[PDB]
Design a protein around this ligand. Sequence first.
Ligand SMILES: CC(C)n1c(C(C)(C)O)nc2c(F)cc(-c3nc(N[C@@H]4CCOC[C@H]4O)ncc3Cl)cc21
Length: 267
Amino acid sequence: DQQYECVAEIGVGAYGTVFKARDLKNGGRFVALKRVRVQPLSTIREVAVLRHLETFEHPNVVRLFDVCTKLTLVFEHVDQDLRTYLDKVPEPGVPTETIKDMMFQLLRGLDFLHSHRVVHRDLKPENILVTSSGQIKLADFGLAVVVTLWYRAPEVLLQSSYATPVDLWSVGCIFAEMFRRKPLFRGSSDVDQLGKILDVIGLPGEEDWPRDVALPRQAFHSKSAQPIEKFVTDIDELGKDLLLKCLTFNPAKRISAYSALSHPYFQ
Ligand SMILES: CC(C)n1c(C(C)(C)O)nc2c(F)cc(-c3nc(N[C@@H]4CCOC[C@H]4O)ncc3Cl)cc21
């Protein structure tokens, strides 16, 4: 494509590469140019879902400017991710109302995706973008040290389920991280990540542990659920309630993005 000039590599990329490029036909604005290889109905369907979502132009998801044919996806460029934002915020950290605003915007973007049956499945500060105006935009969904591990829901770690609640667990981890400015659960393997989660939330009821999984409840020896204020010190009463509703072991009992939008923490 001689309409885009690649200036820097944003990353890779299970089946392609993403570049920061100059959009030569639209005033030379920056775009995130993703080139995806093909070896396919599964892939065609996924890009149709992406194009359909773009018709709504939701304020909390990145704009998809163009799709070209081996597949070129052109998105609006955002200068920073939430990881970079949190790394640069000076002491004593992110202001209370800014944490509230960013979390509300994040849940609005996720509620949009979940209402159109799209599950992000890889929600982390690296793919939550922060615009120059302070707007939160979700990115890197709908296709296909491992930072991903730290935001994985117990049901993904156990290999039991992958429904919309998976993203609400990641929201909970990110919410706690907005205050801490360090990951809540920093594990080095699937089993270890689950162990570190249960050391904080405690062992769930025996009936809440999923059936037909390799890791039984008996493999974890967490004595008690610790108070979340020990790990998230500046969090208020309402924020604590919303956080624990996100960090609920059983995905059926976990708060949805829709209900989280109505939580008294945002009133
Ligand atoms: C990097 C990662 C989350 N990413 C991946 C893969 C598959 C590698 O995970 N695909 C990606 C993709 F298609 C697009 C973007 C994207 N990036 C920016 N800007 C970036 C943000 C990070 O700081 C440098 C800036 O240039 N703006 C808008 C968009 Cl939409 C990021 C992607």
